Design a protein around this nucleic acid. Structure first.
Ligand SMILES: [K+]
Ligand SMILES: [K+]
Ligand SMILES: [K+]
Ligand SMILES: [K+]
Ligand SMILES: [K+]
Ligand SMILES: [K+]
Ligand SMILES: [Mg+2]
Ligand SMILES: [Mg+2]
Ligand SMILES: [Mg+2]
Ligand SMILES: [Mg+2]
Ligand SMILES: [Mg+2]
Ligand SMILES: [Mg+2]
Ligand SMILES: [Mg+2]
Ligand SMILES: [Mg+2]
Ligand SMILES: [Mg+2]
Ligand SMILES: [Mg+2]
Ligand SMILES: [Mg+2]
Ligand SMILES: [Mg+2]
Ligand SMILES: [Mg+2]
Ligand SMILES: [Mg+2]
Ligand SMILES: [Mg+2]
Ligand SMILES: [Mg+2]
Ligand SMILES: [Mg+2]
Ligand SMILES: [Mg+2]
Ligand SMILES: [Mg+2]
Lengths: 151, 31, 92, 101, 131, 92, 144
RNA sequence: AUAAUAGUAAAGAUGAAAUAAAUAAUUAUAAGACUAAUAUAUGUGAAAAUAUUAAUUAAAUAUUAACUGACAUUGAGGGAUUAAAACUAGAGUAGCGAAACGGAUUCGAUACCCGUGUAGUUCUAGUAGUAAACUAUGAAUACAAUUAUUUAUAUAUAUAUAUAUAAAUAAUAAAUGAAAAUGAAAGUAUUCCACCUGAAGAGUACGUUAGCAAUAAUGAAACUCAAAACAAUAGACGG
């Protein structure tokens, strides 16, 4: 009956492509009065709690730390960008609830992010991380890719 | 026949195709 | 029932890079422990005294100790010696 | 230390006969090398004689032959006959299309 | 021809989970018996969680009541039943697979045949001679 | 209602993808190693790379044929090496 | 500006067919775009060597030769100037007809038709907007 | 692709670059095309082809029993089917992508790389009958020495193997061959069809036939030359 938005967990998503690394920190917000609403079916309640809304808090790329052009897709650019994210999560008091890490692709920044989170740079965030997962998107047939490059 | 020998036929076919395209073009202007 | 795969006749039976068991250096493991001992109890802590004494003796004359475990694999000698006998080739 | 890793010690079953070699490291290594899932046949429905296509509405049994992501396992891993592998794959694909797997 | 229908009905009311399934089985059963068809068996499979969230008629679902219906009908009637199931909002997923009767006239449901019971007589004779 | 509140835990994990690991709060680097093993046992990195550029069906078929042969060839090679080792052990 | 400058090879022994078919087209097309062009003339042996540009960096006068040689060499320069007449300004020849020479052509006055890329982007935007309009109609029919 | 949401200032691309309230993230909607694992194209199909699911119709296996009683093989002409591209109409058009216009690279770059991307790629109804349409190997029958591995059928039991008879595949003996190799044929024989007679000219010219068209089929001669080609050998060289 009253909006009671509360954070349930945080999602640390990393997209590691060939030319850049994108790191997004989000909050899974849950209106704790949703079940108190009128005209709400058992299915709508279960469907609302199975995919809770998300709000973006921190969005970073390798170009936000001053890496330009070809340097954006390198191991060092990702390692420093991961550090800046782990710092901004502590400077915003967003290290109270559990964090779920979602990795998307297999570029050069995937192993830098993992190294920065299992090392000194991520000794605070790692303590809250509860689940790691992979979200690489594959196609079963799907659209035709571009032709092979003759180099 | 080997690729080497096939290449001679390839050149002859290319020149015939090139000549027929050229003839076509003329017919269009002359038509 | 387990599918047996039979090779065609081959010019050779050879392992490109035969694997060998290389025992770890005793002095390096001692150094890896002492370094860890200092990481927990602190540098020069009295708890790592024995480690320091052992490390000094291991490296006193040679920093890697008496390395006398060099080995080479004999699989390629036997493989070439026995291939004609065990390949199951039909008679001429 | 009064403790040894389980991988470095062999536990001789009860009622079995042993030789002095059974206390050596060679036995440990030999048991690892020749460690195959041969007891699957007696626990493998698809290696018993049933038709795998009769299990297209039983996702729990079919989920034993797919990886964590649902990828059908190659015959080299399942150890099934050509016919059963062919029938099992059809069952899984039909199960996926029905909305059960 | 003998056919095996597997339908995933929607569970709208958590209080009456097996309500739309009963209403649907009656609708399908009536079509079969009113068009020269025979209904051999109706095996409920219970409420199960769907492998994923599925959609139907601009609605989403996370669970469904599974049920099997072994029936005998003509090909034309079988297509009519499938068409009605593909249109009913209650049905989330429906599949009809033919059960070959070339070698024997009495075949049990795939679920039962998977358990070793090949005919309905074997199932009935295990409920009378031993029950 | 609460019926839709107390049955969300299983429901949440009932629709799993199989690409998730529960982190070991003690050794968090062992959980990332487990996740990498899943990726390699489902060929996720390989499939992604193979989907970047289109390959003609004929070329795809050739590559699939050659790969199978190399896989089968290696199994036949290992079978022959095992025979060599067994023969050597018995003095042949 | 180095992009505007395009280096070209015109050997002294070139045939007036290649000179008036390939080289003429190359020079004329480049000049029409607005790219500067420097034409380097030299003997076939040294002109086209690995040190194509490097040898010309090397740039007692060269001795005279049979007039036939200079009839060819001077004829080439006449053809070059006549070919590049309305497409560029007067040339700055820097060398001797008895040796290497660097003709330095410069594009003639040409206004900037830079408003072409504006149309390009506008057309792309128009197509995208038309696609959206079409997709709205699909959603409407689906709803209806 | 669009919209919303918070959240920002770069993003995207490349060998490196540059051309054209975002990117990323979480939702919702729409559209077209495609079909991950299994998977070996194994198998099936005359070939071309054929691997997401179900159904309908058609065809396809082995053995046994009975029946017909040479009714067979091959096959000029003929007929049917036939990848991709292309073409004629009507739809569709996400992604890909000749061309075109741009950005780079380069001594130059009418290319390789990048962008925007039209035809085409998709479906329906047709035209056309061409591919390294290849196993570069027409079809059928009789026959000849072995092994291994699967598959199928059958038999037996001291119930899970064992013993048989076929098929397939792999490696071979003999034989054949210019050799490379073939291996149940490229062997020993028989029957029928197609095709070839130095290179180049030329699958061209002309004519004819067919097609909306692109084209497809048929298919020469003159002049010139003493060449031209295959397998294998030893070298030299290889970004
Ligand atoms: K095949
Ligand atoms: K007779
Ligand atoms: K006849
Ligand atoms: K004929
Ligand atoms: K299109
Ligand atoms: K024939
Ligand atoms: Mg890079
Ligand atoms: Mg493109
Ligand atoms: Mg020939
Ligand atoms: Mg986006
Ligand atoms: Mg597939
Ligand atoms: Mg085959
Ligand atoms: Mg015939
Ligand atoms: Mg094809
Ligand atoms: Mg059209
Ligand atoms: Mg261009
Ligand atoms: Mg240019
Ligand atoms: Mg392009
Ligand atoms: Mg036709
Ligand atoms: Mg042709
Ligand atoms: Mg032909
Ligand atoms: Mg083909
Ligand atoms: Mg026949
Ligand atoms: Mg012709
Ligand atoms: Mg040769």
């Amino acid at each position: 009956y009253k909006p009671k938005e509360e954070v349930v967990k945080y999602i640390l998503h990393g997209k590691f492509t060939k030319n850049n690394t994108h790191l997004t920190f989000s909050s899974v917000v849950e209106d704790k009065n949703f079940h108190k609403n009128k005209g709400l079916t058992y299915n709508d309640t279960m469907l609302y709690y199975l995919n809770l809304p998300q709000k973006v808090k921190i969005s970073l790329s390798t170009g936000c730390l001053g890496f330009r052009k070809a340097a954006r897709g390198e191991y060092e650019a990702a390692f420093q960008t991961s550090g800046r994210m782990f710092e901004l999560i502590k400077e915003k008091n967003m290290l109270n609830k559990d964090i779920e890490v979602v990795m998307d692709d297999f570029g050069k920044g995937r192993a830098a992010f993992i190294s920065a989170l299992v090392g000194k740079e991520g000794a605070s965030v790692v303590k809250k991380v509860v689940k790691i997962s992979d979200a690489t998107k594959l196609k079963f047939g799907g659209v035709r890719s571009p032709k092979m490059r003759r180099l | 026949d080997s690729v080497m020998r096939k290449r001679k036929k390839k050149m002859k076919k290319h020149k015939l195709r090139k000549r027929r395209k050229r003839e076509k073009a003329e017919r269009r202007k002359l038509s | 029932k387990p599918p047996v795969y039979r090779l065609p006749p081959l010019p050779r039976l050879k392992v490109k890079k035969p694997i060998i068991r290389q025992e770890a250096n005793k002095c390096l493991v001692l150094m890896s422990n002492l370094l860890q001992c200092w990481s927990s109890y602190g540098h020069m802590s009295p708890k790592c005294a024995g480690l320091v004494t052992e490390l000094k003796s291991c490296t006193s004359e040679s920093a890697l100790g008496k390395r006398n475990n060099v080995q080479k694999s004999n699989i390629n000698y036997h493989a070439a010696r026995l291939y004609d006998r065990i390949n199951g080739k039909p008679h001429d | 230390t009064k403790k040894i890793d389980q991988s470095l010690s062999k536990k001789l079953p009860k009622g079995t006969i042993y030789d002095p070699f059974d206390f050596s490291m060679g036995r440990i290594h030999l048991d690892r090398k020749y460690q195959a899932n041969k007891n699957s046949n007696r626990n493998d429905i698809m290696k018993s004689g049933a038709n795998p296509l009769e299990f297209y509405a039983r996702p729990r049994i079919l989920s034993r032959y797919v990886t964590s992501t649902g990828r059908i396992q190659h015959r080299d891993i399942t150890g099934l006959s050509a016919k059963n592998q062919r029938r099992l794959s059809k069952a899984i694909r039909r199960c996926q299309a029905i909305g059960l797997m | 021809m003998l056919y095996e229908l597997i339908g995933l009905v929607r569970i709208t009311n958590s209080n009456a989970p097996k309500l739309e399934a009963k209403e649907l089985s009656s609708t399908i059963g009536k079509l079969i018996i009113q068009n020269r068809g025979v209904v051999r068996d109706i095996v409920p499979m219970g409420i199960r969680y769907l492998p994923k969230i599925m959609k139907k008629d601009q609605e989403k679902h996370f669970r469904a009541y599974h049920f099997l219906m072994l029936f005998d009908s003509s090909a034309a009637v079988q297509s009519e039943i499938l068409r009605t199931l593909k249109k009913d909002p209650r049905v989330i997923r429906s599949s009809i697979v033919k059960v070959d009767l070339d070698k024997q006239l009495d075949r049990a449901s795939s679920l039962h045949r998977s358990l070793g019971k090949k005919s309905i007589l074997e199932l009935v004779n295990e409920d009378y001679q031993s029950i | 209602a609460e019926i839709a509140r107390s049955s969300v835990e299983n429901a949440q994990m009932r629709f799993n993808s199989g690409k998730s690991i529960i982190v070991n709060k003690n050794n968090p680097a062992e959980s990332f190693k487990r996740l990498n093993r899943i990726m390699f046992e489902n060929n996720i990195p390989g499939d992604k790379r193979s989907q970047r550029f289109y390959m003609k069906p004929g070329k795809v078929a050739e590559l699939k044929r050659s790969q199978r042969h190399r896989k089968e060839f290696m199994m036949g090679f290992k079978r022959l090496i095992e025979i060599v080792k067994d023969a050597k052990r018995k003095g042949y | 500006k180095e992009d505007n400058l395009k280096h070209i090879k015109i050997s002294w022994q070139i045939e007036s067919d290649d000179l008036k078919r390939q080289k003429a087209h190359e020079i004329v097309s480049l000049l029409k775009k607005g790219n500067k062009v420097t034409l380097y003339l030299d003997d076939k042996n040294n002109i086209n060597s690995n040190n194509w540009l490097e040898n010309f960096e090397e740039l007692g006068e060269p001795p005279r030769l049979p007039e036939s040689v200079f009839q060819k060499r001077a004829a080439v320069l006449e053809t070059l100037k006549e070919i590049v007449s309305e497409y560029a300004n007067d040339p700055v020849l820097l060398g001797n007809m008895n040796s290497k020479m660097i003709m330095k052509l410069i594009p003639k006055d040409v206004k900037p038709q830079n408003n072409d890329k504006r149309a390009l982007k506008e057309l792309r935007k128009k197509e995208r907007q038309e696609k959206l309009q079409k997709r709205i109609q699909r959603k409407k029919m689906n709803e209806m």
